[PDB]
Amino acid sequence: AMYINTNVPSLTAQRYLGETNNAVSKSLERLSSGLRINSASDDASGLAI
Amino acid sequence: AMYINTNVPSLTAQRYLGETNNAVSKSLERLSSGLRINSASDDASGLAI
Amino acid sequence: SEKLRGQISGLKRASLNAQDGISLLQTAEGGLQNIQDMLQRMRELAVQAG
Amino acid sequence: LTAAESRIRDLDIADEMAKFTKNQILAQSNISMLAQANSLPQMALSLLG
Amino acid sequence: LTAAESRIRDLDIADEMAKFTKNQILAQSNISMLAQANSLPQMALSLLG
Amino acid sequence: LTAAESRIRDLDIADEMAKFTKNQILAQSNISMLAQANSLPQMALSLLG
């Protein structure tokens, strides 16, 4: 059954592209910094040590 | 025999088109996701492993 | 003719009800998947300590 | 939810187009039979006397 | 174990591509045949009338 | 603050493209149906008499 106004695969692909791009940005940040931890959220216990 | 409002071949074509569209949608979802199983219904035994 | 018409109408209504049913289970499995994703991170940070 | 909701928006274009064509075909037969029926009565009677 | 787990990740992309291509080819044939099936019989009958 | 502020500049280009294609493809159907609607009325009554 064909429809119109029903482009769901576009939505799913957009979502997955979102996760891919966010992961790419995070890895870019990490390698450019050259530090494991960065920020304060990646690990909760390494900061104090 | 020629009738009016007996378009059975139209119904057959519509059915086959429906299954074809469903197959296309599932294949597109799978290859965009890059995963075999996805969801919870493709395989019932691989999820726990 | 009347009996066949009634059966056709009933079959169409059941066909609609089927998809009406399937949508709800799709929503439920999405929610369960999110919960399952959270639980494993909990277990990982659990094995962290000790 | 946006997938579920957009299942009561429009039918397949195929069956609607089929119904459109079928009614279009049948209306012309209706009109032609109306014309012939209108021409029928008095023409076949005025020669009685 | 990471080698073992990455055996249910996704199919070798070639076969999924082949499935996509075949289904995409078959859908258009379905659509064309549906169009001709809609076209033929009612026009033939209207010609008869 | 430059990260926070430019979260309110523009959407992803993907959904804008999707809506554009959707509306552009629906406009042609509107035009065709309007043409047929204008075609039907007087041609169907001219042969009444």
Side-chain angles (χ1 to χ4, degrees), chain D residues 1-2 4 6 8-9 12-15 18-20 23-24 31-33 38-41 44 48:
Chain D
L1 269 73
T2 197
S6 188
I8 317 166
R9 291 309 68 192
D12 189 357
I13 314 296
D15 57 357
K19 279 300 300 312
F20 192 33
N23 310 340
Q24 206 172 19
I31 297 171
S32 63
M33 295 299 102
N38 162 26
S39 165
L40 187 153
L48 272 294

mmCIF file of all heavy atoms in Angstrom, chain D residues 1-2 4 6 8-9 12-15 18-20 23-24 31-33 38-41 44 48:
data_model
loop_
_atom_site.group_PDB
_atom_site.id
_atom_site.type_symbol
_atom_site.label_atom_id
_atom_site.label_comp_id
_atom_site.label_asym_id
_atom_site.label_seq_id
_atom_site.Cartn_x
_atom_site.Cartn_y
_atom_site.Cartn_z
ATOM 1 N N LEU D 1 5.034 7.129 17.110
ATOM 2 C CA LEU D 1 3.724 7.769 17.067
ATOM 3 C C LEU D 1 3.447 8.431 15.723
ATOM 4 O O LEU D 1 2.314 8.372 15.237
ATOM 5 C CB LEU D 1 3.586 8.781 18.204
ATOM 6 C CG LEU D 1 2.994 8.216 19.498
ATOM 7 C CD1 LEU D 1 3.981 7.331 20.236
ATOM 8 C CD2 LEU D 1 2.515 9.346 20.393
ATOM 9 N N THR D 2 4.447 9.071 15.108
ATOM 10 C CA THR D 2 4.211 9.680 13.804
ATOM 11 C C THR D 2 4.036 8.622 12.723
ATOM 12 O O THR D 2 3.372 8.879 11.712
ATOM 13 C CB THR D 2 5.346 10.645 13.445
ATOM 14 O OG1 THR D 2 4.917 11.515 12.391
ATOM 15 C CG2 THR D 2 6.590 9.897 12.993
ATOM 16 N N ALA D 4 2.509 5.599 13.436
ATOM 17 C CA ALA D 4 1.188 5.040 13.704
ATOM 18 C C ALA D 4 0.078 5.992 13.275
ATOM 19 O O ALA D 4 -0.912 5.565 12.672
ATOM 20 C CB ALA D 4 1.056 4.700 15.188
ATOM 21 N N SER D 6 0.016 8.347 10.987
ATOM 22 C CA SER D 6 -0.123 8.514 9.548
ATOM 23 C C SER D 6 -0.470 7.187 8.884
ATOM 24 O O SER D 6 0.186 6.771 7.924
ATOM 25 C CB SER D 6 1.158 9.096 8.952
ATOM 26 O OG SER D 6 0.971 9.440 7.593
ATOM 27 N N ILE D 8 -4.137 6.724 8.916
ATOM 28 C CA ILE D 8 -5.526 7.093 8.697
ATOM 29 C C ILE D 8 -5.611 8.405 7.916
ATOM 30 O O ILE D 8 -6.574 9.154 8.044
ATOM 31 C CB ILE D 8 -6.288 7.177 10.035
ATOM 32 C CG1 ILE D 8 -5.919 5.995 10.928
ATOM 33 C CG2 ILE D 8 -7.791 7.110 9.814
ATOM 34 C CD1 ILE D 8 -6.353 6.163 12.366
ATOM 35 N N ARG D 9 -4.594 8.694 7.104
ATOM 36 C CA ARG D 9 -4.543 9.973 6.404
ATOM 37 C C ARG D 9 -5.060 9.849 4.976
ATOM 38 O O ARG D 9 -5.992 10.553 4.586
ATOM 39 C CB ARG D 9 -3.116 10.528 6.422
ATOM 40 C CG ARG D 9 -2.565 10.992 7.789
ATOM 41 C CD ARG D 9 -3.474 11.961 8.577
ATOM 42 N NE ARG D 9 -4.715 11.376 9.072
ATOM 43 C CZ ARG D 9 -5.731 12.074 9.560
ATOM 44 N NH1 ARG D 9 -5.697 13.394 9.625
ATOM 45 N NH2 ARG D 9 -6.813 11.430 9.991
ATOM 46 N N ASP D 12 -4.251 4.177 -0.531
ATOM 47 C CA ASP D 12 -3.402 4.057 -1.704
ATOM 48 C C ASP D 12 -4.006 4.880 -2.835
ATOM 49 O O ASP D 12 -5.226 5.016 -2.939
ATOM 50 C CB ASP D 12 -3.264 2.593 -2.119
ATOM 51 C CG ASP D 12 -2.219 2.387 -3.202
ATOM 52 O OD1 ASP D 12 -1.632 3.384 -3.671
ATOM 53 O OD2 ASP D 12 -1.983 1.222 -3.585
ATOM 54 N N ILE D 13 -3.145 5.467 -3.665
ATOM 55 C CA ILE D 13 -3.657 6.186 -4.825
ATOM 56 C C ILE D 13 -4.276 5.214 -5.824
ATOM 57 O O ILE D 13 -5.149 5.594 -6.615
ATOM 58 C CB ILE D 13 -2.541 7.032 -5.464
ATOM 59 C CG1 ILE D 13 -1.766 7.790 -4.386
ATOM 60 C CG2 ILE D 13 -3.121 8.015 -6.469
ATOM 61 C CD1 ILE D 13 -2.600 8.799 -3.628
ATOM 62 N N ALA D 14 -3.855 3.946 -5.787
ATOM 63 C CA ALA D 14 -4.256 2.991 -6.816
ATOM 64 C C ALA D 14 -5.758 2.734 -6.797
ATOM 65 O O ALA D 14 -6.430 2.846 -7.829
ATOM 66 C CB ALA D 14 -3.484 1.683 -6.639
ATOM 67 N N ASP D 15 -6.310 2.386 -5.631
ATOM 68 C CA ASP D 15 -7.723 2.021 -5.584
ATOM 69 C C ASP D 15 -8.624 3.236 -5.770
ATOM 70 O O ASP D 15 -9.699 3.123 -6.371
ATOM 71 C CB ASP D 15 -8.045 1.309 -4.271
ATOM 72 C CG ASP D 15 -7.700 2.140 -3.060
ATOM 73 O OD1 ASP D 15 -7.160 3.247 -3.235
ATOM 74 O OD2 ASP D 15 -7.961 1.681 -1.929
ATOM 75 N N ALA D 18 -8.677 3.789 -9.393
ATOM 76 C CA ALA D 18 -9.524 2.760 -9.987
ATOM 77 C C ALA D 18 -10.995 3.130 -9.873
ATOM 78 O O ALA D 18 -11.731 3.092 -10.864
ATOM 79 C CB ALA D 18 -9.256 1.411 -9.321
ATOM 80 N N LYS D 19 -11.436 3.506 -8.670
ATOM 81 C CA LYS D 19 -12.831 3.894 -8.472
ATOM 82 C C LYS D 19 -13.195 5.079 -9.355
ATOM 83 O O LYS D 19 -14.278 5.118 -9.956
ATOM 84 C CB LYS D 19 -13.074 4.232 -7.000
ATOM 85 C CG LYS D 19 -13.296 3.032 -6.102
ATOM 86 C CD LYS D 19 -14.504 2.227 -6.548
ATOM 87 C CE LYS D 19 -15.773 3.068 -6.522
ATOM 88 N NZ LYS D 19 -15.926 3.819 -5.245
ATOM 89 N N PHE D 20 -12.294 6.061 -9.434
ATOM 90 C CA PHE D 20 -12.511 7.221 -10.290
ATOM 91 C C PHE D 20 -12.756 6.800 -11.732
ATOM 92 O O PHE D 20 -13.745 7.209 -12.354
ATOM 93 C CB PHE D 20 -11.303 8.152 -10.193
ATOM 94 C CG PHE D 20 -11.523 9.506 -10.798
ATOM 95 C CD1 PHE D 20 -12.766 10.107 -10.755
ATOM 96 C CD2 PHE D 20 -10.478 10.180 -11.404
ATOM 97 C CE1 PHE D 20 -12.963 11.356 -11.313
ATOM 98 C CE2 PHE D 20 -10.669 11.426 -11.962
ATOM 99 C CZ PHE D 20 -11.912 12.016 -11.917
ATOM 100 N N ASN D 23 -16.223 4.802 -12.189
ATOM 101 C CA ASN D 23 -17.384 5.687 -12.201
ATOM 102 C C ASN D 23 -17.413 6.548 -13.458
ATOM 103 O O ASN D 23 -18.485 6.790 -14.030
ATOM 104 C CB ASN D 23 -17.390 6.561 -10.950
ATOM 105 C CG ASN D 23 -17.197 5.759 -9.682
ATOM 106 O OD1 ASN D 23 -17.421 4.549 -9.661
ATOM 107 N ND2 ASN D 23 -16.772 6.427 -8.617
ATOM 108 N N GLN D 24 -16.244 7.026 -13.900
ATOM 109 C CA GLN D 24 -16.184 7.814 -15.126
ATOM 110 C C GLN D 24 -16.708 7.019 -16.314
ATOM 111 O O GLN D 24 -17.435 7.554 -17.159
ATOM 112 C CB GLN D 24 -14.747 8.266 -15.383
ATOM 113 C CG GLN D 24 -14.615 9.541 -16.196
ATOM 114 C CD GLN D 24 -13.186 10.037 -16.252
ATOM 115 O OE1 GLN D 24 -12.247 9.284 -15.996
ATOM 116 N NE2 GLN D 24 -13.011 11.309 -16.590
ATOM 117 N N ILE D 31 -25.626 8.179 -19.343
ATOM 118 C CA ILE D 31 -26.081 9.324 -20.133
ATOM 119 C C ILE D 31 -26.610 8.866 -21.487
ATOM 120 O O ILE D 31 -27.644 9.350 -21.968
ATOM 121 C CB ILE D 31 -24.949 10.355 -20.292
ATOM 122 C CG1 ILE D 31 -24.546 10.925 -18.934
ATOM 123 C CG2 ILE D 31 -25.389 11.480 -21.200
ATOM 124 C CD1 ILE D 31 -23.300 11.776 -18.982
ATOM 125 N N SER D 32 -25.902 7.934 -22.129
ATOM 126 C CA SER D 32 -26.336 7.458 -23.441
ATOM 127 C C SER D 32 -27.688 6.762 -23.359
ATOM 128 O O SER D 32 -28.566 6.980 -24.210
ATOM 129 C CB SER D 32 -25.283 6.523 -24.035
ATOM 130 O OG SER D 32 -25.120 5.364 -23.239
ATOM 131 N N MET D 33 -27.883 5.922 -22.337
ATOM 132 C CA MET D 33 -29.170 5.254 -22.193
ATOM 133 C C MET D 33 -30.276 6.246 -21.867
ATOM 134 O O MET D 33 -31.410 6.092 -22.336
ATOM 135 C CB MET D 33 -29.088 4.161 -21.134
ATOM 136 C CG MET D 33 -28.163 3.034 -21.524
ATOM 137 S SD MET D 33 -28.721 2.202 -23.028
ATOM 138 C CE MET D 33 -27.609 2.890 -24.253
ATOM 139 N N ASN D 38 -35.110 8.874 -23.688
ATOM 140 C CA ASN D 38 -35.841 10.109 -23.943
ATOM 141 C C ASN D 38 -36.344 10.147 -25.381
ATOM 142 O O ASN D 38 -37.489 10.535 -25.637
ATOM 143 C CB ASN D 38 -34.938 11.307 -23.634
ATOM 144 C CG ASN D 38 -35.424 12.609 -24.258
ATOM 145 O OD1 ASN D 38 -36.614 12.798 -24.513
ATOM 146 N ND2 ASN D 38 -34.490 13.517 -24.507
ATOM 147 N N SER D 39 -35.504 9.741 -26.335
ATOM 148 C CA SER D 39 -35.918 9.786 -27.736
ATOM 149 C C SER D 39 -36.968 8.724 -28.049
ATOM 150 O O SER D 39 -37.695 8.839 -29.043
ATOM 151 C CB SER D 39 -34.703 9.624 -28.648
ATOM 152 O OG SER D 39 -35.099 9.316 -29.973
ATOM 153 N N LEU D 40 -37.054 7.679 -27.220
ATOM 154 C CA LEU D 40 -37.937 6.550 -27.520
ATOM 155 C C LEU D 40 -39.407 6.927 -27.678
ATOM 156 O O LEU D 40 -39.948 6.778 -28.788
ATOM 157 C CB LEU D 40 -37.737 5.471 -26.449
ATOM 158 C CG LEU D 40 -38.406 4.098 -26.599
ATOM 159 C CD1 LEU D 40 -37.596 3.047 -25.861
ATOM 160 C CD2 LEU D 40 -39.833 4.100 -26.071
ATOM 161 N N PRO D 41 -40.116 7.411 -26.634
ATOM 162 C CA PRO D 41 -41.583 7.256 -26.600
ATOM 163 C C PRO D 41 -42.375 7.884 -27.741
ATOM 164 O O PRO D 41 -43.084 7.170 -28.457
ATOM 165 C CB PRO D 41 -41.965 7.909 -25.265
ATOM 166 C CG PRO D 41 -40.885 8.885 -25.000
ATOM 167 C CD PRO D 41 -39.634 8.252 -25.524
ATOM 168 N N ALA D 44 -41.934 6.804 -31.643
ATOM 169 C CA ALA D 44 -42.545 5.531 -31.999
ATOM 170 C C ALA D 44 -44.065 5.550 -31.910
ATOM 171 O O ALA D 44 -44.700 4.550 -32.256
ATOM 172 C CB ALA D 44 -41.996 4.417 -31.105
ATOM 173 N N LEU D 48 -48.909 6.456 -35.221
ATOM 174 C CA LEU D 48 -50.138 5.688 -35.042
ATOM 175 C C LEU D 48 -51.324 6.356 -35.725
ATOM 176 O O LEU D 48 -52.264 5.673 -36.146
ATOM 177 C CB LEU D 48 -50.427 5.487 -33.554
ATOM 178 C CG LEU D 48 -49.820 4.265 -32.858
ATOM 179 C CD1 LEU D 48 -50.418 2.991 -33.429
ATOM 180 C CD2 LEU D 48 -48.303 4.238 -32.963
#
